[PDB]
Structure formats: C-alpha cells, structure tokens
Design an enzyme around this catalytic site. Structure first.
Site, short mmCIF file in Angstrom:
data_model
loop_
_atom_site.label_atom_id
_atom_site.label_comp_id
_atom_site.label_asym_id
_atom_site.label_seq_id
_atom_site.Cartn_x
_atom_site.Cartn_y
_atom_site.Cartn_z
N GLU A 170 0.86 -1.22 0.00
CA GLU A 170 0.00 0.00 0.00
C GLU A 170 0.88 1.26 0.00
OE1 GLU A 170 -3.12 0.32 -0.50
OE2 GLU A 170 -3.91 -1.72 -0.27
N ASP B 204 -15.51 -4.84 8.87
CA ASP B 204 -16.64 -4.20 8.15
C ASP B 204 -17.37 -5.18 7.23
OD1 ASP B 204 -18.16 -1.73 7.71
OD2 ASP B 204 -17.36 -1.83 5.64
N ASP C 7 -12.04 9.01 -8.34
CA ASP C 7 -13.30 9.50 -7.71
C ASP C 7 -13.10 10.79 -6.90
OD1 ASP C 7 -12.19 8.42 -5.29
OD2 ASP C 7 -14.08 7.47 -4.72
N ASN D 58 -7.42 9.37 -5.77
CA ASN D 58 -8.22 8.39 -6.54
C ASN D 58 -8.98 9.14 -7.66
OD1 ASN D 58 -8.54 7.08 -3.24
ND2 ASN D 58 -7.12 6.35 -4.77
RH LIG Z 1 -20.12 -1.10 6.21
RH LIG Z 2 -19.10 -1.10 4.16
#
Ligand SMILES: [Rh+]
Ligand SMILES: [Rh+]
Ligand code: NA
Ligand SMILES: [Rh+]
Ligand SMILES: [Rh+]
Ligand SMILES: [Rh+]
Ligand SMILES: [Rh+]
Ligand SMILES: [Rh+]
Length: 129
Positions: A35, A101, A48, A46
């Site tokens: 990274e 997540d 975006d 990025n």
């Molecule tokens: Rh999430």
């Molecule tokens: Rh997510």
C-alpha cells in the site's frame, strides 16, 4: 516516517494487529509494504476525487475527513492528516474498524492482489517479536 519491516511488525503487534479478526501479523506487514512501501506520509489521489492516506492507504470517501471529498463519511472520526503521523496508533485503530466491516482485508486492494494466498509469514521472518 519510513518504517523498517521488523520495526513496523513490532509496532503493529503492540497495537493489537497480530491475528486481529484472524489475520496474522505477516498479512498486515505485507499490506503496508504494497500500500505505502512502509511510508506513514504516503498519499494517493483516486479518480473518484477521494484520497488514500498513510501506511495502510485509508480512504477519505468512508474512513477519515480531508475536507475535499464531497458526500464522504468519516467512520473512523479522524482528520485524514492523523493517518500520516510517525505514530501509527490512528492508522491501526481505523484499520481495525475497516477489517471488521464485512470484506475483511479484501478492503485493501494491494493485500487482495499481492498478499492474499502468499507466504505472508515471510514478511515477519528474522524479526524479534
Ligand atoms: Rh459497512
Ligand atoms: Rh461497508
Ligand atoms: Na471522508
Ligand atoms: Rh507505538
Ligand atoms: Rh486498543
Ligand atoms: Rh523494497
Ligand atoms: Rh486500538
Ligand atoms: Rh509475543
């Protein structure tokens, strides 16, 4: 700060990353290597308009506030600048939320493409841990 391999492994281990959600230390060191090349100050813009910050290239669309990413969340409740410190504490605390997540370490594209399914133990070999 540009970390040594074993210096980072040591700091990540202290901050609770070794087997965090079942990901061995080598996974976290490999991800930081690909990274950021172990550079806490790495930033990358990025397409975006979001930016990736620090040792684990944490994104301003979801995770941190940089004040220039429209419609962004700040789910780690930190300025993105906090992710560039020589102290990795903020990057590690936010990495724990990211990896919890649902997609685990697949959240890190360099991990999925360059570390996943490789001998990641090699990233901590010869380190005093
Ligand atoms: Rh999430
Ligand atoms: Rh997510
Ligand atoms: Na944000
Ligand atoms: Rh530390
Ligand atoms: Rh903690
Ligand atoms: Rh290298
Ligand atoms: Rh923590
Ligand atoms: Rh130990």
């Amino acid at each position: 700060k540009v970390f040594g391999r074993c210096e980072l492994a040591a700091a990540m281990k202290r901050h609770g990353l070794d087997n965090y959600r079942g990901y061995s230390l080598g996974n976290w060191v490999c991800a930081a290597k690909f990274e950021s090349n172990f550079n806490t100050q790495a930033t990358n813009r990025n397409t975006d308009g979001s930016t990736d910050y620090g040792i684990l290239q944490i994104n301003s669309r979801w995770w941190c506030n940089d004040g220039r990413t429209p419609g962004s969340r700040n789910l780690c409740n930190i300025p993105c600048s906090a992710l560039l410190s020589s102290d990795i504490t903020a990057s590690v605390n936010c990495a724990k939320k990211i990896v919890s997540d649902g997609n685990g370490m697949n959240a890190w594209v360099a991990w999925r493409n360059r570390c996943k399914g490789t001998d990641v133990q090699a990233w901590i070999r010869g380190c005093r841990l």
